[PDB]
């Protein structure tokens, strides 16, 4: 019902948890992928300034 579409890009060499020195290669997942999630939280940040 007039849903919002979000463009997504996929990587295979990832650097999670600030890890400078170790990079992981995700092997190719064979087939078509589909997962349905519950977004339950957000992490926001103000811009501040002289307003």
């Amino acid at each position, epitope marked *: 019902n007039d849903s919002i579409t979000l463009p997504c890009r996929i990587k295979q060499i990832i650097n999670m948890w*600030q890890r*400078i020195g170790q990079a992981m290669y995700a092997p190719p997942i064979q087939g078509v992928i589909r997962c349905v999630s519950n977004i339950t939280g957000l992490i926001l*940040t103000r*811009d*501040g*300034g*002289s307003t």
Partner: antibody, heavy 122, light 101 residues
Framework: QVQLVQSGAEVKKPGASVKVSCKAS????????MHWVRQAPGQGLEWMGW????????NYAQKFQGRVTMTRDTSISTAYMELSRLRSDDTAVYYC???????????????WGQGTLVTVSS | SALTQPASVSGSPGQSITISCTGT?????VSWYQQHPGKAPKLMIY???NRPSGVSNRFSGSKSGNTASLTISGLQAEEDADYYC?????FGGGTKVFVLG
């Protein structure tokens, strides 16, 4: 022995761009945010925005939202401040500040750079 | 510029001086900076009263309500500079401290 070294004086045209360097030394560069404060000649301090060297996430002030782009280089431990479309009032000494080692929070700029002077020509 | 600082405060060599920083609203933690002309600012007082290392004990801070104050006892000839009070991201207009006769 926290050392903050900025770039040399810059002279740019109105509407052009200028990128200010800020090389850090004496601590872990990827553990503390990096702020940017400018000061017009004869005026007071003005906070522009902080950048987190970890992920690169910045926080530009609402006054410069859409003009300043803050990046960093973890390999050489140097943060950058680029201001696009320079106006006549942008002539100022641009400092890069860092929070205190203590108190586990920001907003206590103990370490400052020598400053970079930008001019408006005109 | 939500923090109001006096444009000029005078003092004589030896006596004490006081810089008041009145900020609108603001209900905790305040900071003070000293900037000599041609140099970068220097953190003198953080969190109202605490003092970093190694600024002289002659500098002390206080706050009551919407008014924070910086007290400098025993003024010298090198003490005169620009003084700014800080709250979160905001800065004051600045206070020029004079130590002339």
């Amino acid at each position: 022995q926290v050392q903050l070294v900025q770039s040399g004086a810059e002279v740019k045209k109105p509407g052009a761009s200028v990128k200010v360097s800020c090389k850090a030394s004496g601590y872990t560069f990827t553990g503390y945010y990096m702020h940017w404060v400018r000061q017009a000649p004869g005026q007071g301090l003005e906070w522009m925005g902080w950048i987190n060297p970890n992920s690169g996430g910045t926080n530009y002030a609402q006054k410069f939202q859409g003009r300043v782009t803050m990046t960093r280089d973890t390999s050489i431990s140097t943060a950058y401040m680029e201001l696009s479309r320079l106006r006549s009032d942008d002539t100022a000494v641009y400092y890069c500040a860092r929070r205190m080692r203590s108190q586990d929070r920001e907003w206590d700029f103990q370490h400052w750079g020598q400053g970079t002077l930008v001019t408006v020509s005109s | 510029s939500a923090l109001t600082q006096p444009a000029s405060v005078s003092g004589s060599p030896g006596q004490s001086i006081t810089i008041s920083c009145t900020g609108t609203s603001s209900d905790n933690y305040v900071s003070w900076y000293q900037q000599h002309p041609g140099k970068a600012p220097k953190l003198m007082i953080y969190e109202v009263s605490n003092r970093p290392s190694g600024v002289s004990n002659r500098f002390s801070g206080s706050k009551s309500g919407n008014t924070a104050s910086l007290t400098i006892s025993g003024l010298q000839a090198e003490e005169d500079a620009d003084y700014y009070c800080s709250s979160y991201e905001f800065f004051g207009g600045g206070t020029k401290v004079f130590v002339l006769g």
